[PDB]
Subunit: 245 residues, 2 copies
């Protein structure tokens, strides 16, 4: 019955959410045995390289990892807390930091890759791929699965530093704040998110509504819209769950 | 061991080959249960609508269907031929013609669709989709599978007139000409394709080569390239299969 919507409260978080999604898509389609899986894969790599242009990802991740290490050392002197958890999270953060800092430039390996670049040029064209548009991709798919699997794995491994860091920080952020019940009157709602990075919002599918979140800096505004824009009525009162992370 | 490459000898055939591929991709991913399958689906619809701008698809298909009906009535007075096949193919062509001619404007239904248009706007953006970029798509995926399946089926049904016609003509074209053995000396080859619409070219994967087909009108030229552009050697003689359709 429940539906989770997340919203970034800054441009950094918007970037990070996109990267998360794209990297999840790359892990979900192995093994790659046809054009469908292949085009899907390369589209997501191409989009990922384009998302990287929105900010300095490595830089912001190195800062956030340490910041999370700082936000962890407040929880040290708190009875009831597992100190093995704290030390383990600290160690994960530290390792992610030094892996990330030592790693090559983010996805330079992916840009330089001849097969990736080749496919990347053709995605712009509407009927982008076919044996006649992409012969190199066509022959690649006639190889044995293990030759592709190995090529795929080295591509994904070069993203591991980023993946490890991002998985870490977003998980910590997502668990940094609890959900709280709120009410919208006549489909409208607004508040200062403070300097939270992420909104997390739960509705029911039985409401047959969806949120459209506006805002300028942090002061967010929500309009709860129906799916059917003729038949759909907005309730005069709606309760929902909200966490500001 | 064998690898089939096809090449269009005109802009019409290039269009048609792309449409074929895209429509195959739309049929291969049902049922749609997540963002991966959904984005894949909508990307292919969006690309299909863009391919339609390359020519008058309905028009060219109506002509080709009749032309195929004409090319069939030569085979009528040929002993050894099944006359049930001929009459059945004729009847399939005729039906495809009148279905296509009676159908609405090709994929106008798809352009007008609110959900398609909505998603279409967001594909331009690098990290195109997430619950925050596409809330309407997010809620759509929380529905029960049958609500999506029904929506998908009506979308695919509106393409049936095109699909039926195109499947027909391309199959007939592909079988209009037999494969013949040819030889390339030092990775090069050239000939007049006449006014053939399609080249069909078979190589072996063990050759570890691929064709790059040039040309101006019909006079085609082929360079057989290695995959590895340093280690790769081109044989002084290469035999391959070729059909001009």
């Amino acid at each position: 019955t429940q539906v989770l919507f997340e919203h970034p409260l800054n441009e950094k978080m918007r970037t990070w959410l996109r990267i998360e999604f794209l990297i999840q898509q790359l892990s979900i389609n192995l093994p790659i045995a046809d054009h469908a899986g292949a085009l899907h894969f390369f589209r997501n790599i191409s989009d990922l390289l384009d998302v990287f242009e929105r900010g300095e990802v490595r830089t912001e991740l190195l800062k956030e990892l340490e910041r999370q290490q700082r936000k962890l050392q407040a929880w040290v002197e708190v009875p009831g807390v597992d100190q093995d958890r704290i030390e383990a999270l600290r160690q994960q953060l530290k390792s992610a930091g030094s892996v990330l800092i030592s790693a090559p430039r983010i996805g330079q390996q992916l840009r330089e890759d001849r097969l990736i670049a080749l496919v990347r040029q053709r995605l712009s064209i509407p009927g982008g791929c076919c044996s006649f548009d992409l012969p190199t991709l066509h022959i690649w798919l006639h190889l044995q699965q293990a030759q592709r699997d190995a090529q795929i794995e080295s591509w994904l491994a070069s993203l591991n530093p980023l993946t490890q860091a991002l998985t870490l920080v977003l998980d910590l952020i997502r668990n940094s704040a609890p959900f709280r019940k709120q009410t919208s009157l006549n489909g409208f709602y607004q508040d200062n998110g403070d300097d939270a990075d992420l909104l997390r919002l739960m509705l029911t599918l039985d409401s047959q509504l969806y949120p459209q979140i506006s805002g300028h800096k942090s002061r967010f505004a929500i309009r709860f819209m129906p799916l059917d824009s003729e038949n759909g009525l907005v309730p005069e009162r709606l309760d929902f769950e909200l966490a500001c992370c």
